[PDB]
Curated annotation (Swiss-Prot), chains A, E, F:
Residues 5-92 form the PKD domain. Glycans are attached at N68, N83. It comes from the Eukaryota. The chain holds residues 405 to 496 of 1049 of the full protein. The gene is KIAA0319L. Possible role in axon guidance through interaction with RTN4R. Expressed in cortical neurons in the brain cortex (at protein level). N-glycosylated. It is found in: Cytoplasmic granule membrane; Golgi apparatus membrane; Golgi apparatus, trans-Golgi network membrane; Cell membrane. It comes from Homo sapiens. Interacts with RTN4R. (Microbial infection) Interacts with AAV-2 VP1. This is Dyslexia-associated protein KIAA0319-like protein.
Length: 92, 525, 210, 210, 92, 92
């Protein structure tokens, strides 16, 4: 009964706007059984009129303001074991 | 054989045996000497330049080719009436091309005085590309085909092909077919030419409009025992989701389960004949469907067989989705709307989506109102389908052929294709009737007394004349519908007018007023 | 019994390299182009001879009435083809699998035969008095009815362009409806005991897979 | 040796008038409708019997590693078909020409067989140790893999409407993926010396051009 | 070795907003050889949060503010000869 | 010569934003002959930078501000008889 292995890639990224739109793949989630869901939550971000809550494997970002970002991918398997790995995104 | 003996009699009758329509035709041809008997190459670099889209590289062969792939070469408008009024389809079955009665004439120009005396010795070459090892150029309605009115004497169009072109410069694959490298046949004013050609098994053309809309194919009196989802909320309020089905009967035929769906669609821009309604900007080129292989655009003209307009919108027509023939006496370019006659396609609005409409809509997200840990409250949003590819069980109807419309078109020799029916209308044949390229041989004027190794560029001007006869037996599929309401037919209006339709004017110019479709009878789906 | 996207051999690589990486690492001006072999460790990018059949996306409605949105989306928001200017539901449409493995409760809005059990009312019957024909049986070689048949790239990922700089990232758009392409296989719809046998092919000049 | 869009005769007009102008000149309320003949001077608008084959747009990646965008778009941003809820690269997909004439360096992300030269590593090999099969050989009768197969109009150019005025100009949208239509021709993919011979057609109730 | 002929059409246009979106065709670029690229640059415009730089043959305009516009189409052929013709756009 | 019967559904709706987008079907327009056109006009609404004027059978709404809405569907048949029924939309 191995717990899932959550591998978010790329881990570190440097992006300078008029191309704020950035995607970090989260589909590289190793487990014996099916990954029932993916959960994305941004722990830290500069104040923005919106807050990042999604369930997609490939997270889509748009309208990124300058600052430092730290996103957290939480995966759950069939049994229920959860492994959370954090991703750091930086915009110039 | 011999100067004083005609080499073939003028056949022009049109027999109607019954289930076979042999339509002979004969017109007098005059063929000049094109390009001074040379093979000058053509490119936009020589024609003064062109856009990126219009670049081409090809050779201007001096041969003239007889083209007869237009329906009015053979069918007198009365025959075309007898063939659209009561017939459910037709297809060519054989061919017979007698080229007879050549006479070659020599033109002498002394002090600007034209004296034309015939050469009882000069020869004119004829041969048929009977293996299609030449670039097939019949099949774009190139305006050189046989004269609508029999008496009309016509000039044989020049033969010039196109090959690959990176800009205006050729590439290694660019082929150069030398026509004389083919075994010709030499006729010298007493001979005649004749080849018989057997048309391959090409499917019967659809000479009928459907009298049952594809979305009204059901029975209007009985329910359908296939429940459809009707309601999703009980009533206006908070947290009132539900799921109520109901039977799909005659009271609601929209949601009725159906076996088949309308044919493909490639949306065209909409332009209205009432010039006031069109937008006040030049959207001729920018804003029309184009397919653009190899990085150069090209209008999707006329594209996939699609109905021109929804029932009742007669004035409209797609930008680049209908054959638009020019009436006799019209200018080459920048003619007004009334001097060109437009072929509307309302005849297959049953089993084809409207050309200017957007073929339904497809849902783009999930209507999961309340989600577990990722709440979005996303309503079911729908997006349109501007272009739709062929799916499982989809039916459609190919484009119509008009009296002034093409017959055949070679199916490009490719590793695969789907439903090869040439989009301009007609029959798709892997082995169409061959080209018949005719050239009158050079006869050098007077070479020097001293030797000279050049190409002997001084030839004496001359041309040719004769007759050409194309007997092409069609096969009919008679109609046996048990319809009781009188059929709809094609007629010429009984009302006094200055000229009879399809009859010569006071000056002698043969005028065809309107394009004649071939879908008049009605056959239920 | 063999999913069309698991048709390969799970023990041998495939000698057809696929593009795997495009940036060496997080930083400025670090473009690269690294290929790798497509084996059993990564079966997604494996080269394949055939692709799943057509798709005409249907709206998704869930039998657990709580999850459906609180608005009347019965008619507005369902696939329709609409020839001659009058709409008509794409019922039942092209043979498409009703739902992805494990989502039993769902079913497409207008993409499944829904027969009424004996003693049911003519109209406005509840969900339990009508029995719905689910199609999970051809999820192998047909795209899911409520899913969006993959995605197609819509612009060029030319990061640094000559004299017209845009820094446009490779954006992808979904394909809600996809026409029949070269080598595409699919499976026609099932026939049920309470289901039709035949149907006249309309006498038209052409049709596909009647 | 004859591009599908240059199949005509470059010396004779085509007796099928095409709509050329729509406004007489720059101004207010100057709508008109002027046709003209489609000849050799303008071969774009020429009426054509057949149209190029299917398309399923692939991402564009350039062998000159500098031009590719500085982000990992290997997996996210490549065509995939994804039956049964699991994605899978559209490798190699429908036979499509790799690049437009003159753009040799480019190649679609997941649309070409990429064989490994002898002595190459199993994974994470550089670009020069794997040899890529370009398909410029069927650019005639197939749309370019990285290009967007023309465009389709999405609204009605009804400038002045009766009681519902919008002044909507004719807007066009691209077709990233196009299904097989009536009379469309195409050419199947090439076989290389290091390439497969046969492949069993899956035993399914239907397929197209296997 | 003829230089390219750059013909932008339409030359003059009068457009009044809620239809700012206007396209001026630049694909009518006559030359012997292929036009390698098209360059569009707007010489004069009322102050806007964006500046028109593109390489497309058919220039797409959106969000046009009232004022006078003068766009310049620059074409280059295979050899390198450049011909620049200007287009004038006016919005009411 | 029966006049058309205009039946707009749903009549009453309660919607709370980040899902302002709401559609009220108007295609349920009973008549003997074809309904030549549909006309939608909003009699009352909170001040907004835009005013609802459309001819579509299925009215599409977007960017709805809090307040009370009253839309009016006007149908015309072939003969010309018009029947107008009003729809009330409320957003929390």
């Amino acid at each position: 009964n191995r717990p899932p292995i959550a591998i978010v890639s790329p881990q570190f990224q440097e992006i300078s706007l008029p191309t704020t739109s950035t995607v970090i793949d989260g589909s590289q989630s190793t487990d014996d059984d099916k990954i029932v869901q993916y959960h994305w939550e941004e722990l830290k971000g500069p104040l923005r009129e919106e807050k990042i809550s999604e369930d997609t494997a490939i997270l889509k970002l748009s309208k990124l303001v300058p600052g430092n970002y730290t996103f957290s991918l939480t995966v759950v398997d069939s049994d229920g074991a959860t492994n959370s790995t954090t991703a750091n995104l930086t915009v110039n | 054989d011999g100067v004083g003996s005609s080499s073939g009699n003028w056949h022009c009758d049109s027999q109607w045996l019954g289930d076979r329509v042999i339509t002979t035709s004969t017109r007098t041809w005059a063929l000049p000497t094109y390009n001074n008997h040379l093979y000058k190459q053509i490119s936009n670099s020589t024609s003064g330049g062109s856009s990126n889209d219009n670049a081409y590289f090809g050779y201007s062969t001096p041969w003239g080719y007889f083209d007869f792939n237009r329906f009015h070469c053979h069918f007198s408008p009365r025959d075309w009436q007898r063939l659209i009024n009561n017939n459910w389809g037709f297809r060519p079955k054989r061919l017979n091309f007698k080229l007879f009665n050549i006479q070659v004439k020599e033109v002498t120009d002394n002090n600007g005085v034209k004296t034309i005396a015939n050469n009882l010795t000069s020869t004119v070459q004829v041969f048929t590309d009977s293996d299609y090892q030449l670039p097939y150029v019949l099949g774009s309605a190139h305006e050189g085909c046989l004269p609508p009115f029999p008496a009309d004497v016509f000039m044989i169009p020049q033969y010039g092909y196109l090959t690959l072109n990176d800009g205006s410069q050729a590439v290694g694959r660019s082929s150069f077919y030398c026509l004389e490298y083919f075994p010709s046949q030499m006729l010298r004013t007493g001979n005649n030419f004749q080849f018989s050609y057997e048309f391959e098994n090409v499917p019967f053309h659809s000479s009928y409009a459907h009298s049952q809309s594809l979305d009204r194919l059901m029975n209007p009196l009985i329910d359908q025992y296939l429940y459809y989802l009707s309601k999703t909320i009980n009533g206006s309020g908070q947290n009132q989701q539900t799921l109520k089905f109901s039977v799909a009967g005659p009271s609601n035929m929209a949601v009725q389960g159906r076996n088949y769906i309308p044919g493909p669609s490639y949306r065209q821009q909409r332009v209205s004949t009432t010039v006031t309604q069109n937008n006040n900007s030049e959207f001729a080129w920018p804003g029309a469907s184009s397919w653009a292989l190899n990085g150069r655009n090209s209008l999707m003209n006329p594209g996939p067989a699609m109905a021109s307009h929804k029932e009742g919108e007669d004035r409209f027509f797609p930008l680049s989705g209908s054959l638009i023939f020019g009436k006799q006496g019209t200018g080459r370019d920048n003619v007004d709307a009334d001097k060109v006659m437009i072929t509307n396609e309302e005849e297959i609005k049953t089993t084809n989506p409207v050309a200017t409409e957007s073929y339904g809509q497809v849902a783009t997200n999930h209507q999961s109102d309340g989600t577990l840990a990722v709440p979005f409250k996303a309503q079911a949003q729908t997006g349109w389908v501007q272009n739709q590819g062929i799916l499982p069980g989809m039916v459609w109807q190919d484009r119509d052929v008009y009296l002034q419309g093409p017959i055949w078109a070679k199916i490009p020799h490719t590793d695969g294709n789907f439903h090869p029916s040439p989009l301009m209308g007609g029959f798709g044949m892997k082995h169409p009737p061959p080209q018949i390229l005719i050239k009158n041989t050079p006869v050098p004027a007077d070479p020097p007394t001293a030797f000279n190794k050049d190409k002997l560029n001084s030839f004496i001007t001359q041309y040719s004349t004769g007759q050409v006869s194309v007997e092409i037996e069609w096969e009919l599929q008679k109609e046996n519908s048990k319809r009781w309401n009188p059929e709809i037919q094609y007629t010429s209006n009984y009302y006094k007018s200055n000229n009879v339709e399809f009859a010569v004017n006071t000056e002698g110019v043969y005028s065809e007023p309107r394009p004649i479709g071939t879908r008049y009878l009605t056959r239920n789906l």
